[model samples]
Target: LGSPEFMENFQKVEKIGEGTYGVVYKARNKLTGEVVALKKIRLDTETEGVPSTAIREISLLKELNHPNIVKLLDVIHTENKLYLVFEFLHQDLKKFMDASALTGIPLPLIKSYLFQLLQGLAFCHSHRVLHRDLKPQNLLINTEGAIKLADFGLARAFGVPVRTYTHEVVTLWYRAPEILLGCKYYSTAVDIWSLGCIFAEMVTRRALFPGDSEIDQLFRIFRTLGTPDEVVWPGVTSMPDYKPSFPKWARQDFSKVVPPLDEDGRSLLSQMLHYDPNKRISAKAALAHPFFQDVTKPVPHLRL
Candidate 1:
C-alpha cells in the first residue's frame, strides 16, 4: 500500500491568511505548478469525524458554480488533516478598501463589481442558499476585476416554512435589524441586508453601521433608519430581543454620506437598506435596477 500526506504534491509558499474555519496557505502543485490557496482544517476539536462547518462548505462549494463566487478546485482528505483548495486570490474587499484609503472607489468599477456581486448572490439565492456572513472581509476580489464570494462557514441552505436558523450568523457590523431584534425565522433577505451594508461600505470606505456589541449595533441601525415601531417594522415588538428603550433618530441623509452616488444609485441603496426585509430588493431584481444600466449586465438572463 502506497500513500503520502496531502502536502506531498503541494509546496506551501506561505501562510497567506486564516479564515473563520481554518488556516490558509498559498500553495503550488508539485506536478502541475498550479497555484492555489490551501485551507487546512484544524482537527483540534471534541467531536468525531470532520467538522460540520467543513462538511457544509465542501458540499455547498461542490454544487455552486459561479464566476463571482470563489471556485473550490478540490479537497484533500488525509490521515490527520483536511484541506480545501480554492482559487488564489490576492486580497479581500477590506484590504482593497484599506488600500484605497478615504477616497471612494471609481463609480464605474463599483457598478461593475456590484453587478457581478448581485449576479453571484442571485445564483446562490436561486439555489435557496443564504450567505449568512457577508462582510467586506468575506468578499474576495482579484487583480483581474473579479469579485468572488467566500467564507461559506457561516452560510447555510434555507427553504420554505422558514426554518429556525440562528440569528447569530452574520458579522455584527453587517447583521440585519430583524436578526438583531431576535427573529429566528429568516430568509435570503438577511444576505440582501448584508449586501446593502457592503454597498454602503464600497461607497464610503467605512461601515454603514459600526457597532461595539449587539445592543450597540441595534442602536446604530435604529439611529440611521429610525427606531422601528408597529408601522415601520410590524413585528418589532414581538421580537425575542426587542427593546422599547431605543431612542428615535430619523433616517440620516444619504447625500451627506454617499455624496458621489447618482439618483439611481441612491435609490438602489435606499431599497437595499430598507428596515423591512420584505421591502429589500432581491439580487435578481437588483441586477435589473437602473443603477446598473451604466454597467454591462454580466448575466444574460437578467435582461429586462
Candidate 2:
C-alpha cells in the first residue's frame, strides 16, 4: 500500500540517474536502512495529468515478478510527485561496458549476461508483454553479474489479435529494420532485434549500428546485413516507409564485425537479426541455442 507521507520514510542519498519519465535517486529507508532507487515522477503539468508512460510502467511492473526483472518495492504518491521505489543496482550495462572497454568484456561473462537478459525477456514475452524499448542503458547489472531488465516506459501488453502499434519505439541504434521501415503491426520480435544489437555491442565493445537519424539507421543496418527484399523479407516493399530507391548492399561477415564471438554466437545473433520479423528468434528458443550450451546453469558470481 502507498502512503501519502511515505516520502518522509526514505532518506535520499544521491541523484543516481534519470529515465524517460523522471529522475532516479539512490535512497536509504530509515525504517530498515535498506538501500533503494526512487524514481520521482513529477506531476506539475498544467493540462496533462500524470504521464501515461509512468502509469503504464507502474501497472506493468507491478504485475511482473522475476529475478531478472527489476523489482518495484513500493509506490509513494504526493501532491506534485509520484515515486516508484525499486531495488538499487550497482550500475547499468552501458557503464559496465565502458568500464571494461580497455580489455573488453570476457566471453564467459557476456554469455552469462545475455542468458539472464533472454530469461527476463522470455518471462515478459510469455506473459504477452513486449518491452518495446531495450537498450544497454535500460539493462541494470549488479556485482553478482545478474542482469535485470528495467525501464518499461515504452513496453506494451500484446494480445491474441495483434493490433497496430507505434513504430517510434526503441533507440535508433537498436531499432529493427521493420520498425525503421514504419511497420505499425509488430510484436516481441522488436525486442529480439534489440537483443541482437546488444549482443554484438557486448562482443565488440562498440555499437553495431550507430546511426544519426532514422534513415541513417536503416542504411547502417542494410549495409551490414544487406538490403532486405521481398525474397528475404516477404512484403518488405509494402511497408509504410519502404522505398525502392534504397541502396542494395551485401551482408558483411558477422565474424569480422564481432570478432570475439564464436560460431554459435554468430549463429544465434543472425537468427535474432533476421530480416523478417516472423523469422526472428524467440527469447524462449534463444535460451536453447547452441551459443548458450556451455552455460546450462545460471551463473551466480561474475567478477567485473
Candidate 3:
C-alpha cells in the first residue's frame, strides 16, 4: 500500500524537464541528502488509478538493470498523484550537445559517448526490448561523461512471430525509413536507424534530418541516403506508403555530411542506416565495430 510518509522522504528542488509521461523535477532525498529526478504523474481524471504508460515504464525499468540505463530508484504513490524517482543526471544528450556546440564535442568524447550508447542499446535488444523512440532527448548524460538511456514510454517488447506495431512511434527526425514508409511489422532495426541519426548529429552538432512532417522526413532521408528500391531494399516497393513517383536522389558522402567522423565511424553509420531493416547492424555488433577499437575502453570502476 502507498502512504504520504513515502512522499515526504524526497523534496522537490526545481523543475528540470518535461518527460514523455509528465513533468520532471530535480529533487533531493531528505534523509540521505541524495539528489534525484522526480517524475510526477498527475492522477486527477485517471479513474483507472495509474496510466498504462507509467505502469509499463515502471515495470520495464524495474526488470532492466544496467549502468547505461537510467536507474528507477523508487516509486511514491499518493491519493491523487504518482512520482517516479530516478537517479539524477546532469542533463540529457540534446542539452549536452547544444551547450558544447560552440566549442564542439571533442572527437574522443564523441567516440566515448557513441560507444556507451551502443552498450546501453545492446543490453536492451538482448532483453528483447525495443526502445521504439531513440532520440537525443531520451539519452541522459552525467558529469562523468556517462550516457544513460531513459524514457521508456514508447518502448515495446518484441517476441516470437514479430508482432505488428504502429508506425507512429519514433519522432520524425530520427525515425527510420521503414517506419516512415508505413511498415507496421518493424523490428529492432528501427532503433539502429535512430541511433545512426544521433551518431551523425553528435559529430555535426545539428540534426541530420530535420524534417517537418512524415512526407518531408522521408524526402530528407531519401535525399541523403538515396531513394531505396527493390534492388537495395527487398520488398521496399511493397510497403504501404511506397510510391513509384518519389523523386530519386543519389546518396551523399558521409564525410561531407559528418566531417568530424572518420572512415570507420562513417562505415558504422552506414550500416546502421541501411535501407533494409534486416540488414541494419545490431546493437551488439555495433559495440564491436572498428570505430570503437581506438576509443578508450570503459573501465569497470567507472561503470561507463
- Against the true structure, what is each candidate's TM-score? 0.86, 0.88, 0.86
Q: Give the TM-score of candidate 2.
A: 0.88
Locate the minimum summed-lDDT window of 10 residues in model 3: 157-166
lDDT of 1 by residue, 262-284 (tens): 88988888888888888788999
Which candidate, 1 or 2, would have the higher lDDT against the true structure?
Answer: 2
Q: C-alpha displacement of 104 in model 1, angstroms?
A: 3.8
| Candidate 3 error regions (>4 Å) | 44-48, 51-57, 155-170, 297-304
Model 1, runs deviating above 4 Å:
1-5, 51-57, 154-170, 297-304
In candidate 2, list every pair of residues with a backbone clash: none
Give me the candidate number with maximum lDDT.
Answer: 2
Q: What clash count goes with each model?
A: 0, 0, 0
Model 2 lDDT on a 0 to 1 scale: 0.81
Best model per TM-score: 2
Please give the CA lDDT of all the candidate structures: 0.76, 0.81, 0.79
Quote the positional error of residue 220 for candidate 1 in Å.
1.0
Give, for candidate 1, the lowest lDDT window spanning 10 residues.
157-166
